[PDB]
Amino acid sequence: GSMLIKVKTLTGKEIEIDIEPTDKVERIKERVEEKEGIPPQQQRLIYSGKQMNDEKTAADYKIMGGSVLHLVLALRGG
Template sequence: MLITTVTDPSDRRVRTLTGKEIELDIEADYKVSKIKERVEEKEGIPPAQQRLIYGGKQMADDKTAAEYQLEGGATLHLVLALRGGRA
């Protein structure tokens, strides 16, 4: 298991497809699922519709910020995962 300390928790951003940046406090032990909950609090987007991308890879809900080695100034990219339906 990789253990890394994430410093300065207030310096993490989530960027939407429209270019809007959301600043979040992200602690090292936060799971990606909790980060998605924080995005929902600020933007109203349900976690089930969110996909967070870091370093070109989709982040797994059960991993922590420390496991992804999120550092100060890190930017996560938010992609909406909208499910298709019948017309």
Template structure:
């Protein structure tokens, strides 16, 4: 490591780096049967789009899907960033089946 000697007439420039999250991240969706589905998503993607991706992979219509993260049901109109979902997060998929008589 190199040492530098500073005097009162020296100028130091500080550079501020903002932490920009990567645009894509990999998350997992776990079903009640224990099956895990990996999804490559944008950090600001809408929950409704996640459900569409699950339908593409698993054939489950979005209307029948309920996604749970940190014990809370996720709202279709919100972005995953609003739930603080990060790369490696695990969401839980519950099916909302309609009963009838």
């Protein structure tokens, strides 16, 4: 996993994930679920105030090195 990023949850708990710049966000939500119990459906990833679309890549959202992604749960999702 050439690109090592991290996802911060409400509590501030940061989670580290290894991915590729071609990896889709739909897959990050998954690698997030294998590390924490959070199901993809309750996940909203926010990078730079913008919401990431499932069918897109980290490369699209100019994600880099230790770049922080925000995991903000859905309101209508539990």
